[PDB]
Amino acid sequence: DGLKYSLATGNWGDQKKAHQARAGVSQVLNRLTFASTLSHLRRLNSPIGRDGKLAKPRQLHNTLWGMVCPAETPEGHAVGLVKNLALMAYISVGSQPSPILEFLEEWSMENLEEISPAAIADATKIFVNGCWVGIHKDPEQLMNTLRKLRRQMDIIVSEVSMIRDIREREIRIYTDAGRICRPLLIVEKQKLLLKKRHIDQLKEREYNNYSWQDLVASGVVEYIDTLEEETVMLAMTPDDLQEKEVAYCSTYTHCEIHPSMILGVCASIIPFPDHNQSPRNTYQSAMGKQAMG
């Protein structure tokens, strides 16, 4: 009855403590249209109170790029507080940081009990799920080996995010659940790692048991979350930004699959959305859930 009540009424907590219980979860699924059903199944809610007149948490933040649809929000008191997921966005399910710590102990790291606190200034700190585990003195090779192992899927799951903040000398590793991430193509030097044989095999995908998981396992595509993007140099398209010009940049490390993947389910049905005004795109994203079919 506890599971049944909390899933039926929507109040999330004890029924006797319903005053302290959070509400609004587990709404009735919308069946007006298939697009409405999909948008309802892919939706995010900010717990910030709807009554708050503070504008800041409602504004479209830069870090929503590729993760949350910029066009699709409800109109009213909930503007910017209810957000829909991008098409290629994936939410991490979480994993235990048991193998990562063991590999770090194998990779010459110093435990938190054995540091001489005089040598802690030059070395780089290492964080795992927020917990400071130890220090390391060669961040470059460590970060290279970690990225190689993640790309080979060997002992680091592709859902694990690794971040090196050079100026603050910190290295952060998250295996935590709830992190939002999206796939990107790896760029080595000025060239994509995606080549014509991969495309041939994917075009012959039927009766070849070769799929997106085999594409991931080859080290061609990589999952990247929000705060790892801070250390990423992204190219909008390969044929345009990888080729030599009067150069803006040469250290590109990743490339988007396609720029249209930043839109949500309801905003992906709009023809020519870049030729319209953004309020009109938002209005269409809201009205598409009410279109009959």
């Binding site: 029924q15 006797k16 319903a18 005053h19």
Partner: protein, 48 residues
């Protein structure tokens, strides 16, 4: 309280009943009194 006053039981129980009656009488007029436990219906719902 009328019964306990007719019995004359113990001055402590009379005072406790007086406090309880004060709470209920005040809470019938005002249930939004801060610093005090707001009255509850058997549902766990607060009174109007």
């Amino acid at each position: 309280l009328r019964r306990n006053e007719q019995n004359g039981a113990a001055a402590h129980v009379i005072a406790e009943d007086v406090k309880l009656l004060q709470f209920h009488v005040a809470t019938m007029v005002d249930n939004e009194l801060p610093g005090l436990p707001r009255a509850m219906q058997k549902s766990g719902r607060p009174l109007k």
